[PDB]
Amino acid sequence: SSGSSRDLFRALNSFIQTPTLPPPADLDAIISSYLERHDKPEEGSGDRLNDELLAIWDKAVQDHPEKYAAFVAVLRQLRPGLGAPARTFQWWDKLLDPVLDNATREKGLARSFMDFTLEILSSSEGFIPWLNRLLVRWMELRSTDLKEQVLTDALLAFGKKDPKGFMNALNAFVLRREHRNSAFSLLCAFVNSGPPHLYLILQTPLFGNILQSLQKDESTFTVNLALIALVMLLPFFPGDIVPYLPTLFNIYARLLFWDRDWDKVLLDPDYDGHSVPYLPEYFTILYGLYPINFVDYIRKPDVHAAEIRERSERFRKQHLLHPNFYEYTIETEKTNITRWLKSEADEIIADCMALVVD
Amino acid sequence: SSRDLFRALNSFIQTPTLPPPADLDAIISSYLERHDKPEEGSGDRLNDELLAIWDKAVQDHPEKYAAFVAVLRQLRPGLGAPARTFQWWDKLLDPVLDNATREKGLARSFMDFTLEILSSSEGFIPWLNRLLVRWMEDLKEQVLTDALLAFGKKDPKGFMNALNAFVLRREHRNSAFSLLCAFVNSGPPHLYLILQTPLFGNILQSLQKDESTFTVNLALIALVMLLPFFPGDIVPYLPTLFNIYARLLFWDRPWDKVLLDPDYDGHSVPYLPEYFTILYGLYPINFVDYIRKPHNYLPHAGSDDDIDVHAAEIRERSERFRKQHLLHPNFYEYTIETEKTNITRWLKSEADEIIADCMALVVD
């Protein structure tokens, strides 16, 4: 009883028929001996194992949700022996909806499937088909339940692996009006999880569409979500936003006068307020990154210009004199990038917060 | 009634009641009535008689000094030439000062005599110089102080012209700067006239050259108090004002200089933070540009790093003041040129308003 493929069939079928909560050590031994003694899974060993796992799922597991967690636990250990890497997709894709429908009711099922997802992403590695399935189910879903945690944590895991792919797929949902609020909410959650290579959003249409929402959408709730995402994103590529400064400043002027005057989101008269709540934080990040250019915009964007100053007064009285005023001109502030070489986003955010008095 | 006036005076000196008797004021009033031109002979004879009484009866009798001053106050309109009143004030100054603490009302009577002189039909430098010299040498101090402030309130430019002579003397600079602070604090008018007098330049000269921490700090307090009274006129002085800040920022590292006093002088100028506030409050864009690029203000060798090391050091030491001040509204309104060129800021503003606006920028 040490590595036979016949043994794996007998041990798995016996375990599925009477599952224990962690798989016993002697089951791990049979699997480990099997994986060692089968070195060519793509030559036939993986195919016969797949047919067996398919049979066990069909005949014994598919219609017994209490057995899902046990089957996933076995599926995690036997993953290296499946053979072609497309078979592991086929199994995760096969288990997605069965796991999602029973995440809140079957103990440990969410945990086992999440560990299964994480192990797939961190082995020997075009995630668009995975992401879209997670995205479409997450958009339709709208205290957090286990079903929503699985979709969120899986989306965050896939986004951590492929940040550029995560944002390209999300951009499609930003373009549709009925999902823009949900897409922007998930974007905030993505940036909050601290994924790498957030600067890749510039090689993707998402950044421009965030700005388009801030310029065109008329719902106070939508624009505020877009503004929160923008404030979180800018510290991750501050030296690359120089061409966007006129747009960013015009967005500030629009939100500053929110009480006055592309698939648009209209105003919701039931919930939308008359001022953008996150506008003060937007002033802070603009003043923290490019103060000399920002105050020059406020100085020289007529009557409307004078009003821009008057409405900026309550933000001026909240910020200390910026150190850039001792070091740079309006030109070298945009051109000299030494500020950004030395500091990362977490330091840059802290430095911006250090300027706020109230 | 000329002759009957003298009879009352001669009798009163030997027979004074602490207030003058009822019969003396009546003769005086009628005397001044029928004497319509005192500078044409009547005032001259009155002076000669008053001198005689002082010599033969008053000079060495201090209790009659107070009585004599009361007589001199009432007969002041009839003395004639304005030099006659000064001659008597000049003549009585030292006798009054020597007995101010011991003879009751004498200090107050001479002060009221001084106030009556200043409030009738009206430079004052000879008055001030006499007061200044004695002040540089308590009711005696109060008389000298109140009179100097009273003369300074009437003639502010003359007060500061006379004070400039004592500022130029090293042994008198600390006291002169202290008196200047007391003068500005007394709220005198026309403080902007200090620019049409050499005193302002010598305040800046002390700030640039003197080496006593105490002296420079006094000069800095005077400068901080003065700027809100003429903020739009200091544009030609900005390079000097900025260089003074840089010198005091590194305090731990002809003209009669006050040297360092090893007994009390510290290693830092206490009033430097307030100087940053007033400079940043009045000309922020020009001030931060000086800190940004002091190359534009200081002779230097462009092929060396000494001007860059100095620039970084000025910035690094200015960090603690930067963290104390809000963003200035000028950064929304002016360029470095129009901040110096646009004077609308200063038209409606008074000294107290400019100070309050400068304080509104301080985080404390």
XYZ file of C-alpha atoms in Angstrom, chain A residues 253 256-257 260 297-312, chain B residues 332:
21
model
C -12.768 72.724 -9.863
C -15.561 72.297 -5.785
C -18.688 73.683 -7.501
C -23.940 74.542 -9.166
C -3.962 76.575 -11.035
C -6.091 78.079 -8.258
C -4.460 81.455 -8.925
C -4.765 81.276 -12.737
C -7.190 78.597 -13.941
C -12.422 86.176 -13.874
C -15.464 85.832 -11.590
C -15.312 82.028 -11.505
C -11.582 82.158 -10.722
C -12.207 84.457 -7.747
C -14.844 81.995 -6.525
C -12.365 79.114 -6.844
C -10.075 80.931 -4.402
C -12.911 81.656 -1.972
C -14.043 78.024 -1.983
C -10.430 76.844 -1.601
C -3.492 81.941 -4.653
